Amino acid sequence: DDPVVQEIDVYLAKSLAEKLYLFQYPVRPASMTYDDIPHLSAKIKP
Amino acid sequence: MLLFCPGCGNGLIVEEGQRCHRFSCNTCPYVHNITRKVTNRKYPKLKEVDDVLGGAAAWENVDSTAESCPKCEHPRAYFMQLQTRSADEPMTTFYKCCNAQCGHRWR
Amino acid sequence: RPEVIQSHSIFEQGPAEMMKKKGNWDKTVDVSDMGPSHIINIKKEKRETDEETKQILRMLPKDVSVAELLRELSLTKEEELLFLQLPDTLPGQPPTQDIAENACTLADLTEGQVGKLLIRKSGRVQLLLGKVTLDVTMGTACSFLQELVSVGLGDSRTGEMTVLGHVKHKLVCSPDFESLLDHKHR
Ligand SMILES: [Zn+2]
Ligand SMILES: [Zn+2]
């Protein structure tokens, strides 16, 4: 079994290594995104 | 069926409003007007069996035939053997004999 | 209530039951095409299986990593944000990081090409990450919402929050212990 397809290169970036988070919503399905609803306040402790 | 609020994810209840029946949350203003026919079918299990039994062939699908009982000696028989009492070092048997429908049941 | 109810031998017509059942609930008061009576199609109530959200309407097999990368490459040119897990240590030395042989992660490496990804014949997918090849498997398939955000603290008290896109699929990487062990058996 030779690698018949897709010898895909894998890179690495560090410019967002300390800014990137991942917000996941356990109760909201993938169809009903929050892309349309306006937002008011965003608060965080680093 | 369970239906849950897109806002807070509590369970909805059915209530009646001024124009429609509504699914409504108990903890947030969200309501959903029932505009058209909505249904939920259970499809339970029916009582499938009728179950007649006790036939003679259902009685004599056991090994023994043409043996000898100490009472009426008939060939058509229905035997049994036990051992599950080790105070009884001898074996344990019980026999049914029904050629002439005499119906003995002894040790 | 009269108890001695009477019954008859006649056989019920199939359509007669069908049309009685039909007439019992096909009546609709949907004539009120009004604002209150109207309903927002993008805020339907959530039926519980999240893949199966639609209970009211206007009217599955488990994919694998080679089918995952084929649909994102051949079927569509559009890019997609993945979410891949790694093994606990990556097979490198921390480059002048003041150590002990501790864990080597992505936080210690540098920018540049880190490896190559080999999709083999018959569905085998490996991650050649140097001299060792890891193994890539599809993880548990999530079906809830996931958003990939950039939180930047440009000032001590204020900053920027930006959403980069939605993450759909989750990949899992694991070392091939049979091939690692078959080099020098023990
Ligand atoms: Zn609610
Ligand atoms: Zn007898």
Proportion in β-strands of chain B = 25-35%
Q: Please write the CATH class name of the domain at 56-106 in chain B.
A: Mainly Beta
Which quaternary structure do these chains form?
Answer: part of a larger assembly
Show the largest interface. A-C, 36 and 46 residues
Strand content of chain C: 25-35%
Please give the largest β-sheet of chain B.
3 strands, antiparallel
Helix content of chain B: under 10%
Query: How many E-type strands of chain B?
Result: 7
Main location (chain B): nucleus
GO cellular component, one term (chain B): nucleoplasm
Protein name (chain B): DNA-directed RNA polymerase III subunit RPC10
Zinc finger (C4-type) (chain B): 5-28
Account of the 3D structure:
In chain A, 0% of the residues lie in helices and 35% in strands. Chain A has strands at residues 5-10, 20-29. Chain B has one helix spanning 56-59, and strands spanning 3-4, 13-16, 21-24, 31-33, 77-82, 92-97, 104-106. A three-stranded antiparallel β-sheet of chain B has the order 2-3-4, with no helix packed on it. Chain B starts with a strand and ends with a strand. Chain C is elongated, with a radius of gyration of 30 Å. The termini of chain C are far apart.
Keywords:
part of a larger assembly; 3 chains; A: 46 residues; mainly beta; 35% strand; B: 107 residues; N-terminal domain of TfIIb; 3-stranded antiparallel β-sheet; 1 helix; 26% strand; binds zinc ion; Zn_ribbon_RPB9 (chain B); innate immunity (chain B); immunity (chain B)
What would a concise description of this structure say?
The structure is cut from a larger assembly and holds chains A (46 residues), B (107 residues) and C (186 residues). Chain A is 0% helix and 35% strand. With 46 residues, chain A is mainly β.
